[PDB]
Symmetry: D2
Subunit: 88 residues, 4 copies
């Protein structure tokens, strides 16, 4: 299943998302944020999508009506930075 | 499998693509073209990805080193319009 | 004067434009097309805006309700390619 | 004068900017951030460019090698939010 969902975040920022499912389960999300196309893979353990690029580790948490785009710099001192809190 | 591929087309136009595979086979492609995020599903019969939106029916043909972005307006008189011929 | 105008072209392609005027006259246009920010300068002789980058010579013709995005490759054999015919 | 400058910010975020000058002085900046084209006018008093849209009041401070994208929500309780700290 392929589903296009547009999210509207603070400052009227639009985050377009493509969700890709496989056999009932979340598998992939692709989104456009900060001028990048960000491919993310579902992480059932973290219950969040995590960018496939370890260098540029966006995370996208789908919580139904709401969603959160965060980012973790690739550093042990780095903490997850919430970048946007979205609504579809 | 999730794979980010960037394509460079005529006029140095960059088409970012996310390919999503399922059990060895192509399944989905997501690309950014003409300022849109375009979700496409693999069509084995047409051996091309076809937008999930019948209204805005981009097609993306992956031919290895080269790729073609086309579009079909949703009309019986409409013919496939080649929009870009890409290289990765 | 600075004016944001959004144009809707074929395939529902949106071309956002910023027009910059100086002392009553057109001076600059900035648009987003083909994933690029394209800065153009008014050419009174050609009555069209011409990209400042001679390498990537978009032209934008403002004809009121309608507008045309064209491109000229930097070659003597090259002819102006109409890329989009827009409406605001 | 029309000048294209690309800025690289945190998370490798690229902010393309067009600066428009008039008779030696800054006048306008157009940038692409958060998926928007943002037209800004120079404010000599604030020594920063301020979006022409009072609703979506990005500010862009050009400090030579470095630059800052901020935003002010249109509310008396709102404080300027630094969104990015850029380098050209």
């Amino acid at each position: 299943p392929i589903e296009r969902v547009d999210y509207i975040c603070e400052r009227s920022v639009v985050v377009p998302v493509t969700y890709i499912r496989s056999n009932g389960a979340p598998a992939a999300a692709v989104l456009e944020v900060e001028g990048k196309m960000v491919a993310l893979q579902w992480h059932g353990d973290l219950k969040k999508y995590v960018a496939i690029d370890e260098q540029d580790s966006y995370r996208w948490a789908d919580r139904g009506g709401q969603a959160t785009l965060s980012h973790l710099e690739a550093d042990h001192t780095a903490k997850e930075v919430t970048l946007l809190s979205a609504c579809r």
